Amino acid sequence: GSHMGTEDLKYSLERLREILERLEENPSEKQIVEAIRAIVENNAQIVEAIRAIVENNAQIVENNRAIIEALEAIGGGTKILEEMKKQLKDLKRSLERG
Amino acid sequence: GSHMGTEDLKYSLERLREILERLEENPSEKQIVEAIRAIVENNAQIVEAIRAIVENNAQIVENNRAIIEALEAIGGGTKILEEMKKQLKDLKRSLERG
Amino acid sequence: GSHMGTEDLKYSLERLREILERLEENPSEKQIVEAIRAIVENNAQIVEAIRAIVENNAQIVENNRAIIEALEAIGGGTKILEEMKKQLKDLKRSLERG
Numbered sequence: 001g002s003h004m005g006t007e008d009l010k011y012s013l014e015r016l017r018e019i020l021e022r023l024e025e026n027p028s029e030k031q032i033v034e035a036i037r038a039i040v041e042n043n044a045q046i047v048e049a050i051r052a053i054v055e056n057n058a059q060i061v062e063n064n065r066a067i068i069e070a071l072e073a074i075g076g077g078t079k080i081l082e083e084m085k086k087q088l089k090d091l092k093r094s095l096e097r098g
Numbered sequence: 099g100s101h102m103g104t105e106d107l108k109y110s111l112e113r114l115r116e117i118l119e120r121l122e123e124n125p126s127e128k129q130i131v132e133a134i135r136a137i138v139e140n141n142a143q144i145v146e147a148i149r150a151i152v153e154n155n156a157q158i159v160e161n162n163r164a165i166i167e168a169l170e171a172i173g174g175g176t177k178i179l180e181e182m183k184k185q186l187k188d189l190k191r192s193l194e195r196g
Numbered sequence: 197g198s199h200m201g202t203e204d205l206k207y208s209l210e211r212l213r214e215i216l217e218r219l220e221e222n223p224s225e226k227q228i229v230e231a232i233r234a235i236v237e238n239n240a241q242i243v244e245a246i247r248a249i250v251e252n253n254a255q256i257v258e259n260n261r262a263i264i265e266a267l268e269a270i271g272g273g274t275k276i277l278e279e280m281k282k283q284l285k286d287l288k289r290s291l292e293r294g
Contacts, residue, residue, distance in 0.1 A: 047107040070276035080168035178266035
């Protein structure tokens with residue numbers, strides 16, 4: 001699995017903090033570059049973490065549509081059909097984004 | 099549409115990577131500032147990407163409530179009413195956050 | 197509440213922008229470190245904002261499962277049971293991630 005945890009992001013930034021503190025205490029070209037490096041890598045980690053979450057969210061959206069279809073089946077003939085079908089289409093719209 | 103894709107974030111960071119590599123190979127005031135600039139802009143892109151996603155998530159939460167109301171209708175008289183109504187309120191709580 | 201708003205992230209980055217602009221206009225060791233500092237802090241804010249959102253999303257996933265159980269109850273005997281139960285398990289999988 002390529003899924004990244006929220007805690008994983010935190011731990012990476014804790015290291016970044018250390019580097020920052022070292023930079024502030026003893027400003028230098030080395031510490032500046034190392035600080036930037038860590039930030040650049042961490043930025044990727046954040047996006048990658050978001051990616052996995054978004055992909056999961058997409059599955060949830062699809063799952064939500066499955067509920068509607070099942071609901072409309074057993075609720076067949078009930079007014080709710082008029083509005084629940086509209087929601088399904090809206091979920092599809094969301095499904096195609098991420 | 100102002101929606102930003104996950105891939106869009108990646109591509110921006112790929113450019114950032116290039117700048118980092120140039121910085122590391124040839125440290126300089128120019129490369130430092132340019133690296134920082136790219137990071138600052140990319141940070142905005144991440145938040146803006148999150149914004150759109152969160153706004154979509156808010157709509158999903160509202161949509162989830164719509165399912166409950168439709169469900170409670172056809173399930174009227176069924177015990178589930180006691181608990182499903184509690185969920186709806188919880189979804190509302192989430193709806194008002196983002 | 198420890199929940200952070202999307203707007204909160206924006207406002208922080210607006211300050212970061214100002215620092216960047218000052219850096220670009222007058223490059224200096226001071227502005228470089230201050231720019232990095234702000235970025236490091238803002239990176240934490242982004243992750244913390246994500247954390248709260250993800251935790252909320254987890255609750256939504258659980259809530260979605262509650263809908264299924266209520267649906268399956270009133271729809272008992274209906275074919276939908278075969279597929280809706282599969283979704284519930286998939287939601288559980290998502291619930292255990294974040």
